[PDB]
Amino acid sequence: AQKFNGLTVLPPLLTDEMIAQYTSALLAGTITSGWTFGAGPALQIPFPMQMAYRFNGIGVTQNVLYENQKLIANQFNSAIGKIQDSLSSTP
């Protein structure tokens, strides 16, 4: 990380803000479009509708979701909540 004897560092041509904006656009498109933004124009599908499709894509029906919506939301929010503790407590 020094600048001596003829070696010179070059800055990134796309800095971290637009990288964060591209990942934010990815997350926004997949939270409010399903897979439709990844193929053509984005289409409006609700996220429990999309997760019912992805349950239908994995081979289980709708009634494991629509009868268990708060349980799936609790497991999902607890599962994403332990991501921060797993990364923060492991160097």
Partner: protein
């Protein structure tokens, strides 16, 4: 991986030291919005379609496929039953048609 969108099949062609690809690709166009619901309540049980959803064109409740506006009448052959009307959210009141009772009653 092949094309940009929903792939169908591909055309292989030659280059002097390489290869060029052609990809016929399904892209949707001219999209409309409707009113959806996960289930339809009829006679105290929860109804769910075979390979689609419940849609309505403002008034009349229809069953269509996922990638096209091709509506159908809610009938007992393109719709299976699971559970009751209470444990599911988003369920509204409509009817599911019987294709056997006029032929049973009014003729024989």
């Amino acid at each position: 991986f092949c094309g940009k969108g929903y792939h169908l099949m591909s055309f292989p062609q030659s280059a002097p030291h390489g290869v060029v690809f052609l990809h016929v690709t399904y892209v949707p166009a001219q999209e409309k919005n409707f009113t959806t619901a996960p289930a339809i309540c009829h006679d105290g049980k929860a109804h769910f379609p075979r390979e689609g959803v419940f849609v309505s064109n403002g008034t009349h409740w229809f069953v269509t496929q996922r990638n096209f506006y091709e509506p159908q009448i809610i009938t007992t052959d393109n719709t299976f039953v699971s559970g009751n009307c209470d444990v599911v959210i988003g369920i509204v009141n409509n009817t599911v048609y019987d294709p056997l009772q006029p032929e049973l009653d009014s003729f024989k």
